[PDB]
């Protein structure tokens, strides 16, 4: 016997106490060591309901990641309200590492193992674990990076596809790499390279998946309709520097129409900018950091998911229009914690 419950979790990690990189520092005094011999066992003849869209584990991970960045990303200036906060702002070492979320005594986590699970509803093949797998807390917009991959098919996740105020998480089958560099002029100009060939192939099989869920209406992609640069652009942090990359070429219907068309294959160069004045995702305000370091600043990452928002209203179509980005940062964790839920033993 057990029941859905919520409780304060602890985290587990392999952070090096000697290292200076900020994730290792936070985890060293905030988490405990991983269990080397972790036991998980199938729950024979059991069917459980999961709901990735209402899962307190997500709120808990968010509170930690917010806590990490506050402790670790010290801006020279922080602007909020009519307050101007000025501290010391030295360059840091920044590379996310896997954190495990674990239950205390009396409780336990349930894991859905259906390869096709979409985040909500019954799950057949279930097991139980002390801790989740290791989740890199990668903060990004539009694209999900360095996450885990959908097991069998590409998987569309939403709390309600018919509700245009609800985020769509596309979970990729296979991953497409993006190669961002700020070469060793303009110290903030950068660019991201993507194998144009593989991305269109994938993106096309995404449109087909969406056609499945939207009754074969024409599926169209468009750039965001507005908002702060943090959402109109693929926004992420690399080596402690804040990148903003124009994804307009990534949502380029020309190559999605399947038309055997020229330069659809071959490398795609997204122009990026490194900014020092950023609008914080955690809390309401602006943060100003010092200019970028020198040398070749290079983060190669895996695209493993896509966040979409669907245009509301009107119809009288014919088609359905999707734009990159959606939701909030909690959605990034949600996309990794989707197969887990905490229950209490009695």
């Amino acid at each position, epitope marked *: 016997v057990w029941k859905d419950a919520d409780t304060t979790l602890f985290c587990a990690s392999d952070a090096k106490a000697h290292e200076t990189e900020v994730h290792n520092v936070w985890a060293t005094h905030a988490c405990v060591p991983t269990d080397p011999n972790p036991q998980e066992i199938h729950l024979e003849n059991v069917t459980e309901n999961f709901n990735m869209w209402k899962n307190n584990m997500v709120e808990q991970m968010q509170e930690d990641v917010i806590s990490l960045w506050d402790q670790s990303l010290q801006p020279c200036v922080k602007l909020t309200g009519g307050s101007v906060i000025k501290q010391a702002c030295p360059k840091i070492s920044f590379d996310p590492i896997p954190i495990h979320y674990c239950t205390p005594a009396g409780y336990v986590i349930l894991k859905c193992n259906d390869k096709n699970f979409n985040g909500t509803g019954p799950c057949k093949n279930v097991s139980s674990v002390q801790c989740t797998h290791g989740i890199k807390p990668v903060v990004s917009t539009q694209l999900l990076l360095n996450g885990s991959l959908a097991e069998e098919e590409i998987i569309i996740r939403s709390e309600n596809l018919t509700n245009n*105020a609800k985020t769509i998480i596309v979970h990729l089958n296979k991953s497409v790499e993006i190669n961002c560099t700020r070469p060793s002029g303009d110290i903030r100009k950068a660019y991201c390279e993507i194998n144009g060939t593989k991305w269109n192939k994938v993106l096309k099989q995404v449109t087909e998946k969406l056609k499945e869920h939207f009754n074969n209406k024409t599926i169209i992609f468009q750039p965001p309709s*507005g908002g702060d640069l943090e*959402i109109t652009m693929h926004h992420f942090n690399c080596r402690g520097e804040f990148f903003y990359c124009n994804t307009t070429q990534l949502f380029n219907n020309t190559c999605i129409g399947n038309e055997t068309m020229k330069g659809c294959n071959g490398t795609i160069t997204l122009p990026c900018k490194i900014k020092q004045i950023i609008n914080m*995702w955690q809390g309401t305000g602006q943060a100003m950091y010092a200019p970028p370091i020198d040398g070749k600043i290079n983060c190669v990452s895996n695209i493993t998911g896509i966040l979409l*928002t669907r245009d*509301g*209203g009107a119809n009288n179509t014919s088609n359905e229009t999707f734009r990159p980005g959606g939701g909030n940062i909690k959605d990034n964790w949600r996309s990794e914690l989707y197969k887990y839920k905490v229950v209490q033993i009695e």
Partner: antibody
Framework: QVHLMQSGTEMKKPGASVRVTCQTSGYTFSDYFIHWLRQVPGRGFEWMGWMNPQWGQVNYARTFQGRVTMTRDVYREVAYLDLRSLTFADTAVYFC???????????????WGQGTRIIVSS | SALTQPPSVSGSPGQSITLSCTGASTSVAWYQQYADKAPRLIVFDGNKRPSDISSRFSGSQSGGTASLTISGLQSEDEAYYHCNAFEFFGGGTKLTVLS
């Protein structure tokens, strides 16, 4: 108590643009979307779009796409609606609205501004 | 006119009456609107009533068919009534109360 307080009546000429302001108060502005709708008196509401004040994300009705923008001022706690290329077809009362607390339902509009009359005439 | 509502409906003081809203793709919300005034939410999620709304008002909905029942009608109930499901609204119903 939550209050949505809109700017006054605008009389505009065809081809012009108008901005309507919606001053928020009584709650944490960043925690809720602001929607805009319009209505010809005696008729039904027409939804125009939503705006998420966090990072300013917006979702506009296909009808208004390219003619509308919804912005905000996170500190002063105000949402703006801008509409351009006005026509007599845009004469109406314009409202901002906000959902009920907590619900998770996004479309239950407990809170409305008082409405702003926009009159388009040459 | 995504959702379907009769444009006009009339009732007598003291009796019940049920306004209808058809075509909904989810559970509906209902609003009362006086002329030249702002709407106010009278039921949400098809049949839920906000704590401050009079018990004379009640909602019921099956699939896309939604209904709003007002009992013990009063002249003060004369207004437009609207319903939405997501971003889709009805055309509004003007309720008259024959005074």
């Amino acid at each position: 108590q939550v209050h949505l307080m809109q700017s006054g009546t605008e009389m505009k000429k065809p081809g012009a643009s108008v901005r309507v302001t919606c001053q928020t108060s009584g709650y944490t502005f960043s925690d809720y979307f602001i929607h805009w709708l319009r209505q010809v008196p005696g008729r039904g509401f027409e939804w125009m779009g939503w705006m998420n004040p966090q990072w300013g994300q917006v979702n506009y009705a296909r009808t208004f796409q390219g003619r509308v923008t919804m912005t905000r001022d996170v500190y002063r706690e105000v949402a703006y609606l801008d509409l351009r290329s006005l026509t007599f077809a845009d004469t109406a009362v314009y409202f901002c609205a906000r959902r009920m607390r907590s619900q998770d339902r996004e479309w239950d509009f407990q809170h409305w501004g008082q409405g702003t009359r926009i009159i388009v005439s040459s | 006119s995504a959702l379907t509502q009769p444009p006009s409906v009339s009732g007598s003081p003291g009796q019940s009456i049920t306004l209808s809203c058809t075509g909904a793709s989810t559970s509906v919300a209902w609003y009362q609107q006086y002329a030249d005034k702002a709407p106010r939410l009278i039921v949400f999620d098809g049949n839920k009533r906000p704590s401050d709304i009079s018990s004379r008002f009640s909602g019921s909905q099956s699939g896309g068919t939604a209904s709003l029942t007002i009992s013990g009608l009063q002249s003060e109930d004369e207004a437009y009534y609207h319903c939405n499901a997501f971003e889709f609204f009805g055309g509004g119903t003007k309720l008259t109360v024959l005074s």
